[PDB]
Design an enzyme around this catalytic site. Sequence first.
Site, mmCIF file in Angstrom:
data_model
loop_
_atom_site.group_PDB
_atom_site.id
_atom_site.type_symbol
_atom_site.label_atom_id
_atom_site.label_comp_id
_atom_site.label_asym_id
_atom_site.label_seq_id
_atom_site.Cartn_x
_atom_site.Cartn_y
_atom_site.Cartn_z
ATOM 1 N N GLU A 45 0.797 -1.236 0.000
ATOM 2 C CA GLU A 45 0.000 0.000 0.000
ATOM 3 C C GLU A 45 0.835 1.295 0.000
ATOM 4 O O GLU A 45 0.505 2.276 -0.717
ATOM 5 C CB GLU A 45 -0.992 -0.012 1.169
ATOM 6 C CG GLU A 45 -2.002 -1.179 1.147
ATOM 7 C CD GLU A 45 -3.090 -0.993 0.103
ATOM 8 O OE1 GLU A 45 -3.140 0.114 -0.503
ATOM 9 O OE2 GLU A 45 -3.875 -1.941 -0.136
ATOM 10 N N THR A 71 -8.835 5.397 2.073
ATOM 11 C CA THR A 71 -9.407 6.001 0.875
ATOM 12 C C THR A 71 -10.925 6.194 1.101
ATOM 13 O O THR A 71 -11.606 5.258 1.537
ATOM 14 C CB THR A 71 -9.139 5.139 -0.362
ATOM 15 O OG1 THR A 71 -7.738 4.837 -0.459
ATOM 16 C CG2 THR A 71 -9.582 5.875 -1.655
ATOM 17 N N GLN A 106 -14.347 -0.609 8.898
ATOM 18 C CA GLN A 106 -13.477 -0.957 7.759
ATOM 19 C C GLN A 106 -13.569 -2.412 7.277
ATOM 20 O O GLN A 106 -13.683 -2.673 6.060
ATOM 21 C CB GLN A 106 -12.020 -0.530 8.009
ATOM 22 C CG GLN A 106 -11.098 -0.660 6.773
ATOM 23 C CD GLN A 106 -11.579 0.138 5.608
ATOM 24 O OE1 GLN A 106 -12.120 1.248 5.773
ATOM 25 N NE2 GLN A 106 -11.364 -0.404 4.389
ATOM 26 N N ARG A 138 -9.108 -4.409 0.194
ATOM 27 C CA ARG A 138 -10.087 -4.495 -0.922
ATOM 28 C C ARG A 138 -9.787 -3.580 -2.108
ATOM 29 O O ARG A 138 -10.646 -2.791 -2.492
ATOM 30 C CB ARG A 138 -11.494 -4.200 -0.410
ATOM 31 C CG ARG A 138 -11.835 -5.042 0.816
ATOM 32 C CD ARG A 138 -13.286 -4.952 1.173
ATOM 33 N NE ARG A 138 -13.766 -3.588 1.399
ATOM 34 C CZ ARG A 138 -13.842 -3.018 2.595
ATOM 35 N NH1 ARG A 138 -13.424 -3.669 3.675
ATOM 36 N NH2 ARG A 138 -14.340 -1.803 2.722
ATOM 37 N N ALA A 140 -8.990 -2.539 -6.129
ATOM 38 C CA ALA A 140 -9.535 -2.969 -7.418
ATOM 39 C C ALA A 140 -8.968 -4.318 -7.888
ATOM 40 O O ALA A 140 -9.736 -5.218 -8.245
ATOM 41 C CB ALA A 140 -9.336 -1.880 -8.467
HETATM 42 C C1 LIG Z 1 -7.350 1.295 -7.875
HETATM 43 C C2 LIG Z 1 -7.580 0.889 -6.449
HETATM 44 O O1 LIG Z 1 -7.850 -0.277 -6.138
HETATM 45 N N1 LIG Z 1 -7.466 1.838 -5.527
HETATM 46 C C3 LIG Z 1 -7.237 1.349 -4.181
HETATM 47 C C4 LIG Z 1 -8.458 1.589 -3.306
HETATM 48 O O2 LIG Z 1 -9.592 0.998 -3.928
HETATM 49 C C5 LIG Z 1 -8.207 0.959 -1.937
HETATM 50 O O3 LIG Z 1 -9.138 1.524 -1.031
HETATM 51 C C6 LIG Z 1 -10.290 0.659 -0.876
HETATM 52 O O4 LIG Z 1 -11.285 0.856 -1.870
HETATM 53 C C7 LIG Z 1 -12.429 0.027 -1.741
HETATM 54 C C8 LIG Z 1 -13.387 0.179 -2.938
HETATM 55 O O5 LIG Z 1 -13.570 1.531 -3.323
HETATM 56 C C9 LIG Z 1 -13.142 0.236 -0.401
HETATM 57 O O6 LIG Z 1 -14.116 -0.790 -0.284
HETATM 58 C C10 LIG Z 1 -15.462 -0.268 -0.137
HETATM 59 O O7 LIG Z 1 -15.737 0.144 1.186
HETATM 60 C C11 LIG Z 1 -17.026 0.690 1.423
HETATM 61 C C12 LIG Z 1 -17.101 0.880 2.932
HETATM 62 O O8 LIG Z 1 -16.855 2.235 3.207
HETATM 63 C C13 LIG Z 1 -18.196 -0.193 0.946
HETATM 64 O O9 LIG Z 1 -19.398 0.560 0.801
HETATM 65 C C14 LIG Z 1 -20.391 0.268 1.823
HETATM 66 O O10 LIG Z 1 -21.070 -0.972 1.648
HETATM 67 C C15 LIG Z 1 -21.998 -1.326 2.671
HETATM 68 C C16 LIG Z 1 -22.710 -2.621 2.283
HETATM 69 O O11 LIG Z 1 -22.882 -2.688 0.884
HETATM 70 C C17 LIG Z 1 -23.041 -0.231 2.945
HETATM 71 O O12 LIG Z 1 -23.752 -0.538 4.137
HETATM 72 C C18 LIG Z 1 -22.435 1.177 3.013
HETATM 73 O O13 LIG Z 1 -23.458 2.149 2.900
HETATM 74 C C19 LIG Z 1 -21.398 1.419 1.910
HETATM 75 N N2 LIG Z 1 -20.731 2.687 2.163
HETATM 76 C C20 LIG Z 1 -20.403 3.561 1.210
HETATM 77 C C21 LIG Z 1 -20.316 5.009 1.598
HETATM 78 O O14 LIG Z 1 -20.156 3.226 0.056
HETATM 79 C C22 LIG Z 1 -17.920 -0.892 -0.385
HETATM 80 O O15 LIG Z 1 -18.810 -1.987 -0.484
HETATM 81 C C23 LIG Z 1 -16.463 -1.360 -0.525
HETATM 82 N N3 LIG Z 1 -16.170 -1.816 -1.872
HETATM 83 C C24 LIG Z 1 -15.480 -2.941 -2.100
HETATM 84 C C25 LIG Z 1 -15.109 -3.205 -3.534
HETATM 85 O O16 LIG Z 1 -15.147 -3.732 -1.203
HETATM 86 C C26 LIG Z 1 -12.138 0.115 0.757
HETATM 87 O O17 LIG Z 1 -12.698 0.523 1.986
HETATM 88 C C27 LIG Z 1 -10.851 0.913 0.515
HETATM 89 N N4 LIG Z 1 -9.816 0.560 1.456
HETATM 90 C C28 LIG Z 1 -9.396 1.339 2.460
HETATM 91 C C29 LIG Z 1 -8.328 0.725 3.326
HETATM 92 O O18 LIG Z 1 -9.832 2.486 2.690
HETATM 93 C C30 LIG Z 1 -6.781 1.196 -1.385
HETATM 94 C C31 LIG Z 1 -6.456 0.091 -0.391
HETATM 95 O O19 LIG Z 1 -6.185 -1.094 -1.107
HETATM 96 O O20 LIG Z 1 -5.724 1.213 -2.346
HETATM 97 C C32 LIG Z 1 -5.944 1.884 -3.575
HETATM 98 O O21 LIG Z 1 -4.903 1.562 -4.490
#
Ligand SMILES: CC(=O)N[C@@H]1[C@@H](O)[C@H](O[C@@H]2O[C@H](CO)[C@@H](O[C@@H]3O[C@H](CO)[C@@H](O[C@@H]4O[C@H](CO)[C@@H](O)[C@H](O)[C@H]4NC(C)=O)[C@H](O)[C@H]3NC(C)=O)[C@H](O)[C@H]2NC(C)=O)[C@@H](CO)O[C@H]1O
EC number: 3.2.1.-
Length: 159
Positions: A45, A71, A106, A138, A140
Amino acid sequence: MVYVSNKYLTMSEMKVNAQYILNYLSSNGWTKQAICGMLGNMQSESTINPGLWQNLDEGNTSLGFGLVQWTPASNYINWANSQGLPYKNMDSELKRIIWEVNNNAQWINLRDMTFKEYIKSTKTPRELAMIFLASYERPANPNQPERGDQAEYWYKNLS
Ligand SMILES: CC(=O)N[C@@H]1[C@@H](O)[C@H](O[C@@H]2O[C@H](CO)[C@@H](O[C@@H]3O[C@H](CO)[C@@H](O[C@@H]4O[C@H](CO)[C@@H](O)[C@H](O)[C@H]4NC(C)=O)[C@H](O)[C@H]3NC(C)=O)[C@H](O)[C@H]2NC(C)=O)[C@@H](CO)O[C@H]1O
């Protein structure tokens, strides 16, 4: 003594930070295995650099920042500010991770392991690195086996 910057860290620099983190989280009850699985993720990361912005894009709070690349960065930075902690700070970032374990933030349980199970686990640093990737990070692109190799490298090489 830790490195905090918006730059990719060398293996020697990462090792200083990585030992710091292991010491810190051991006192908060994590296993060496659980910490090393997370370290293998933090290397990919941020090169385990609490000062690091995604793409080295300093000040872009829409993108990733810090050890685990929170993020959008604002999720973390808002928390630090709201908590009276400096955001660009090793301990402030470890406090966030502890806060997440405590408040079940998270983590999404994709692998039949909760975050609280995770930090007490003695599975291999490789297996834990993969679980932490899938449940916490999580990104891409999901098949990043390098993270497991790295978890094993730190487990071997730190004390
Ligand atoms: C190119 C690339 O991969 N960039 C990397 C970043 O993606 C990565 O950071 C992580 O990104 C993912 C996806 O964008 C993120 O996962 C998402 O998290 C949210 C939670 O906040 C989920 O959304 C929620 O879902 C629940 C149930 O469906 C709901 O109750 C709620 O309302 C939702 N909230 C909102 C506001 O959306 C997503 O479901 C979930 N998506 C996936 C695909 O899992 C991670 O949290 C990010 N990680 C971190 C540590 O912040 C980063 C780390 O690898 O690196 C970049 O390169």
